[PDB]
Design a protein around this ligand. Structure first.
Ligand code: HEM
Length: 188
């Protein structure tokens, strides 16, 4: 992972489980607890895995459970560090623009690999969004969706439709229903 995202994870882990659980976790992987991560730096995904695994051991929660909680809370963290992606927007627009944001990011940041989040309208009040990655972070993805709903204070229901791996790609498709109509039919 690029250092920007990893940095938000550390902060979010602290906010959720406290400095002690986090200090010992970073130490367990030979990191300095107060490590400063630079935005463009690359962090070994395996070291992250080991950190979250230690968090799991210390807190008693399973790793999946932790990733779901981090997903929910990290939206707040990210919104603090990068408000321009949230400013003046509403949930539906935020969710539908995110795939392009990732593709743009990939081009502007060497080595960055944000997952695909292709979204499409399926009803006047609903979209489908498919997470496609090399990384299988299913619970984090689901958590981020829930976190977005809280941040924007717009209630939604999320229904998982597909999950599975193929050709080394993890895929997870959800149907997200909004309270009010967000789409209308227009001539093509
Ligand atoms: C402010 C909006 C967002 C920005 C700027 C952003 C950007 C990024 C970046 C830079 C990464 C790191 C990729 C890497 O280090 O190689 C990442 C990872 C990720 N992004 Fe976002 N993202 C945003 C919102 C979202 C949302 C709303 C979702 C889901 C609904 C999402 C899903 C994910 C997931 C699940 C990962 C983990 C990597 C993986 O699973 O493959 N992101 N994103």
């Amino acid at each position: 992972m690029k250092g920007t995202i990893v940095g938000t994870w550390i902060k979010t882990l602290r906010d959720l489980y406290g400095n002690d659980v986090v200090d010992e976790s970073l130490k367990s992987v030979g990191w300095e607890p107060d490590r400063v991560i630079t935005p463009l730096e690359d962090i070994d995904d395996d070291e992250v895995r080991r950190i979250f695994a230690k968090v799991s051991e210390k807190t008693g929660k399973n790793v999946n459970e932790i990733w779901r909680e981090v997903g929910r809370q990290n939206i707040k963290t990210f919104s603090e560090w990068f408000p321009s992606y949230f400013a003046g927007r509403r949930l539906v627009n935020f969710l539908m623009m995110m795939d392009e944001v990732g593709l743009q990011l990939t081009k502007m940041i060497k080595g960055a690999t944000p997952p695909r989040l292709i979204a499409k309208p399926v009803a006047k009040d609903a979209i489908e969004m498919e997470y496609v990655s090399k990384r299988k972070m299913y619970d984090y993805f689901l958590g981020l969706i829930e976190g977005s709903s809280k941040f924007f204070k717009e209630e939604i229901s999320v229904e998982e439709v597909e999950r599975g791996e193929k050709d080394g790609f993890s895929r997870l498709k959800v149907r997200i229903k909004f309270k009010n109509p967000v789409f209308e039919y227009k001539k093509n």
